[PDB]
Design a protein around this ligand. Structure first.
Ligand SMILES: [Zn+2]
Length: 205
């Protein structure tokens, strides 16, 4: 099944992942209700997710998307937060579980952090029922996402699948619209859970 390889903090690969995670934190419109109040994360560990079958499924779909998009799969590295992280690293993303019934990714780690415990932070951490828990270790993924031909929009366009000839939907920010970008796929084989990040949000002074 799945192997989790720990990255060393002194390794450039670990530093690249942590840097992308910390530098993409932003202030949210809810003032921190969903994901908590913090300026920085405390990274516990970063693991690379290895699974032969998941990799086959992802590479097979990447080839189809490339053929349908002028020989360009159009991959982006993006964050994902959800209460299904354990099922994802063993079974892969599954669409069966704003732009409708898709799988959502963000370029801002703090946006994904808002979904780690569910919609609007759900009921918070399982132990303390705290959306802003500074104690419990959280996890998010930093994924390879096959976007192919993306359908860009500034406002809600609810769909069950990407529009004809397209492979993903992108919600772009605008004043009066979305605060931050979101990337949506409608097939789980269009994302690979490359990195598993275990962390805490830090309580500011
Ligand atoms: Zn907790």
């Amino acid at each position: 099944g799945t192997i989790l390889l720990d990255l060393a903090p002194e390794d450039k690969e670990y530093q690249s992942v942590e840097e992308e995670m910390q530098s993409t934190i932003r202030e949210h419109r809810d003032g921190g209700n969903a994901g908590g109040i913090f300026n920085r994360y405390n990274v516990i560990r970063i693991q690379k997710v290895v699974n032969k079958k998941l990799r086959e499924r992802f590479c097979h779909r990447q080839k189809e998307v490339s053929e349908e998009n002028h020989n360009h799969h159009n991959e982006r590295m993006l964050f994902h937060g959800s209460p299904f992280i354990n099922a994802i690293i063993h079974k892969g993303f599954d669409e069966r579980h704003m732009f409708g019934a898709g799988i959502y990714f963000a370029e801002n780690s703090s946006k994904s952090n808002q979904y780690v415990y569910g919609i609007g932070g759900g009921t918070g951490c399982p132990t303390h029922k705290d959306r802003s828990c500074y104690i419990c270790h959280r996890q998010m993924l930093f994924c390879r996402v096959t976007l192919g031909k993306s359908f860009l929009q500034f406002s809600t366009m609810k769909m069950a699948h990407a529009p004809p000839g397209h492979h993903s939907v992108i919600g772009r920010p605008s004043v009066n619209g979305l605060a931050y970008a979101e990337y949506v796929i409608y097939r789980g084989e269009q994302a690979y859970p490359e990195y598993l990040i275990t962390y805490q949000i830090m309580k500011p002074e």
